[PDB]
Structures are given as structure tokens and as C-alpha cells.
Structure 1
Amino acid sequence: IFLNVLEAIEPGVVCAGHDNNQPDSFAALLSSLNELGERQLVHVVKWAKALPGFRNLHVDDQMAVIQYSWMGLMVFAMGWRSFTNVNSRMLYFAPDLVFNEYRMHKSRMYSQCVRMRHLSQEFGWLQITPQEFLCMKALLLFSIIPVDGLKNQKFFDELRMNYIKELDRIIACKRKNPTSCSRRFYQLTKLLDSVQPIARELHQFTFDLLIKSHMVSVDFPEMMAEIISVQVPKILSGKVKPIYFH
């Protein structure tokens, strides 16, 4: 039942709306990634809200959790698309925004792109299952909270704990075995922790970009600028931190 829902609520394809006839320029490429961010967020909000047990969380916590976790959530799914599609050779941000080494450079994001490409690579190196992925992605929504807890921190802990048990559940079967089960869970929880440093590098990047957006001609859509100037700082100043397994 858990998996039927995750499989059922999983978002479809989201295009960034990039003009691929115009030259790659920092401004263009980043305005596109931002718009894509605005579009994908609309879908993350719907998905999250349709997550089993999600409604147990307090209304403000529901929103807060989405607002702190979107970067890692989008980065993780983006790595999956790059994987199932381009076998991790390039970053499949959208069907109309697939970065090559040249785009990775002309974006002043080469490094972060290397790390995300590296993540996508892990889905391969580890042979991640579509279902392990659905579960791992679900748990990333419950992977970053304020240091002083949320309004109803007891519902989040319940919720989060349950998602950890489903992850172990979907490996403890044919998706693990012999001496795998223990090793399999150590590597998946290790792969999950890996998305966090990558998310933080992008948080600082996007934040700096937003402060000087008017000068590099890159513009951030409504929700992006608001969430980047209201929520992301709380993360960057240490008020909200990721939950690490290791």
C-alpha cells in the first residue's frame, strides 16, 4: 500500500521553458533553472500534500518542511532523470534543459554540477531501484528541520520514523539479502546524506545569485525569490539544519 501511493503520486515531466535557439549565457541558463524551480515547486507542493500520513503534521510544519527541503528533493529527482535517461552523462534538468560540460561551465556552477552528476552516477554505481528511489525521495522531505524543532515536533518524528521503516522495508526482501541488508541500508543512508552538502552549496549559490540578480540580469520568479530570501537564510545561518544519518 505505501508503495502504490508513492508510485501513484509521483510527478510527471516538467519543462523549464528554455529557448534552445538562443546562445547559452549565464543569465539565460539561470533564469531558466529558476523558472523550472518555480514550476517544479508547484508539483512538489502537491506531491508532498498527497504523501501518506503527511496531514498529521501541523499546517505550518507542512509548509515549513516543503520550504526547507525543496532543493534536496529536486536535486535528487533530477539525478534520477539524468540516470534513467542520459545514463548520467549530462544533467537532465528538464527535457528542454539538459546541461553538457559546456553548459555546466557557462552557468558558473561547474563543481556543483559535478557533484550532482556524481549523485546521478551513484544511482548507477549502486543500482538503485525505482522503489528505493521513491522511498528515499519521500524521506528527503523529512530531512531538514529547525534546531529548536517545529510546532508539532512529535508528529514529524513519528512521520519521519515511519518513512525510515518503509525504506528498510523495501530493501528487506529481494532488494537485499545475505549480508546485503545491513550493507544496503548503510549505503542508501550514506547516499541520502550526500544530497545535503550538495543542497547547501546550491542554497548559498542561489542566495548570492538573488542578492545580485539585478546586476547579472538573472531573475527569480515570485515564489523562488520569496523562499530564497525568507527560508534559505534560516538554513544558511544555522537555524534549520539537515538531519544526517551518519
Structure 2
Amino acid sequence: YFSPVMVLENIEPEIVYAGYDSSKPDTAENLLSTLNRLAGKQMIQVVKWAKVLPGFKNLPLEDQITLIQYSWMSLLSFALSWRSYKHTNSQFLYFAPDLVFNEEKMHQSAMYELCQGMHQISLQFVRLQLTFEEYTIMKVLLLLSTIPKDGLKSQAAFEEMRTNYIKELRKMVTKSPNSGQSWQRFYQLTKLLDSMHDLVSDLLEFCFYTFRESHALKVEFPAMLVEIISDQLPKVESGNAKPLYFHRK
């Protein structure tokens, strides 16, 4: 099928600014609108990254779109956990260099409990001493972690790409052994990936609610998000989504 991990390290999108206006009142609507603007810019980076991801081009265009649309929240949350870990040792939520959430911002954004759920993932990065190599492979696995209930147009091609990145993750964990054993670390990483589905389910519930009442709440959505959410919301709410778990329940 195929160093794919060294390609991943080099194609990682550069950090972008939120364009946060600290002179404007820190209302839930202003903070959420800033976060949405930032997500729109990061989704453009995600698409550019996916385009040069080894093996992604082999999948048909319709499947590439499906995968990006189902996984967008997972990818954004996982990268936020990484930035939080790398730049603050997971003390804060590092959305961007100009937008770092402390307890005050978590309360002001009206998303305190969701932010705490996210902060718990970045704390697991500290516990595990997650490496950049592990992180990049895991992020590809998240892009490939949600499919339609009736599967993709090219299901076999998708499964081949997914299997090969799981093999890459298993090869990578050998570099961080305890005794010299690495099976333990592999299952700690797959448990971590599986736990992203429940956190993302809660983030999407909040997102969809704000999307359905955006003008009433004074929350703005960039075009990229309008397009993604408009397609994803009826698919997710009708149960057409299928999260792929390494370890059931």
C-alpha cells in the first residue's frame, strides 16, 4: 500500500489566528462567532491537508467529501487538544495564539461543561506523553472514523487506507515501550480515539442547536461551516452516521 508518518509531520497545517477582538464585550455570542470564524479558516486547512494525505486521493471525490463532513468536529477538537498540550501543558484550551481559554472564557462562552470535557482529552495527552508522530497518525484515523450507515461508494478502498494507518500506529507505539512491551500503549491510544466519539457527539449537539437558532442567539457562521453543517445535521440526527469503534461499548 505504501515513510507515511514523516509525510504527516511535514504536511501538518500551520497554526492560524482567531482574529479575536478583545475590545468587544466577551458575550457568549461574540466568543462563539469568533470560534466559528476560526473553525471555518481551520476547515480550509483541513481540506488542503487531506488533499496531500497519503492514500486519500485514491478514494472517490464523493467519499472524500463524506469523510471530511462526518469527521470535521473530531479533527478540530483533536487538534485543539494537541495545541493545548503542546503550548500550555494542557492548563488552557489553546484555540489560537490570540484566543486561549481560561476558566473565565469557558464560562463566558456558555460552554463550560463541553470545554471541561475537551480539557480532559488534553490532560490524557499529558498522562500518556503523546508524541507528535502518534498524534499525526491518530488524526488521520479520526478523519476515517465515521462513515454512512450504508457505507461509502468505495468501501474496500476506504478499509484499505484505514487498515494501513492502524498498522502505522501499531509500528509507531514500539518506539515508546515500558519490559520493552508496546501492546499496552497501542490499547491506551485506541481507547483514547474511541472516547473522541462521545465528546464529539456532545459538541455536535451544541453546534446543531446554535446553527438552528444562530440569529436568535446572535451567532455568526462562515460559509464553510454553513455548508458542512447543512449537509451533516440531517444525516447525524436521522441516524445515518456510523461511528467506527476499535472497541465496542
Report what 2:218 is aligned to: 217
Residue 60 of structure 2 is matched in structure 1 by 58
> Which whole-Å deviations, capped at 9, do the CAs of 1:198-222 have from their partners, x for residues lacking one?
1111111110001111111111111
Counterpart selection for 1:105 from 61, 85, 107: 107
1:80 — aligned with what? Answer: 82
Paired residue for 1:41?
A: 43
Q: Find the partner of 2:22 among 20, 23, 31.
A: 20
SS in 1 for 2:88: coil
- After superposition, the CA RMSD in angstroms is 1.1
**Structure 2: segments with no counterpart, 5+ residues:** none
Quote the Cα distance in structure 2 between the aligned partners of 1:233 and 1:177.
Answer: 45
Alignment of 1:1-246 (within 5 A): 1-172=3-174, 174-176=175-177, 178=179, 180-246=181-247
Letter paired with 1:160: R
Query: Quick check: 1:20–1:96 contact (8 Å CA) kept in 2?
Result: no
Question: For residues 160-193 of structure 1, what are the alpha-carbon distances to aligned partners after superposition, in whole Å with 9 as ceiling and x for unaligned?
Answer: 0111000001112x32253631111110000111
Distance 2:112 2:141 in 1: 28
C-alpha distance in structure 2 between counterparts of 1:220 and 1:229, whole Å: 11
Q: How many positions carry a matched residue from both structures? A: 245
Q: Which amino acid aligns with 2:33?
A: S
Residues 36-45 or 12-21, more deviating = 12-21
Stretch of structure 1 that moved more, 92-101 or 232-241? 232-241
Q: Which runs of 5+ in 1 are unaligned?
A: none
Q: TM-score, normalised by structure 2?
A: 0.95
SS in 2 for 1:170: helix
- Residue 116 of structure 2 aligns with an amino acid whose one-letter code is V
Output one character per residue of 1:35-91: Cα deviation in whole Å (capped at 9) or x when no partner.
011000000001011110111111100111011111101100100100111111110
Asked if 2 retains the 8 angstrom alpha-carbon contact of 1:9 and 1:50, the reply is yes
Offset of 1:237 from its aligned partner?
A: 2.4
The structural deviation recorded for 1:95 is 1.0
Shift of 1:138: 1.3
How far, CA to CA, are the matches of 1:178 and 1:143 in structure 2? 32
Distance 1:195 1:78 in 2: 12
- 2:54 is aligned with what amino acid? P
SS in 2 for 1:111: helix
CA distance in 2 between counterparts of 1:217 and 1:228 reads 17
Q: Give the distance between the partners of 1:24 and 1:207, measured in 2 at CA.
A: 22
* Aligned equivalents of 2:136, 2:83: Cα separation in 1: 13
Question: TM-score with structure 1 length normalisation?
Answer: 0.96
Q: Following the alignment from structure 1 to structure 2, what is the Cα–Cα distance between the partners of residues 206 and 123?
A: 25
What is the CA deviation profile of residues 76-132 of structure 1, one whole-angstrom value per residue up to 9, with x for unaligned ones?
Answer: 010010011111111001111111111111111111100110100111011111111
How far 1:195 sits from its partner (Å)? 1.2
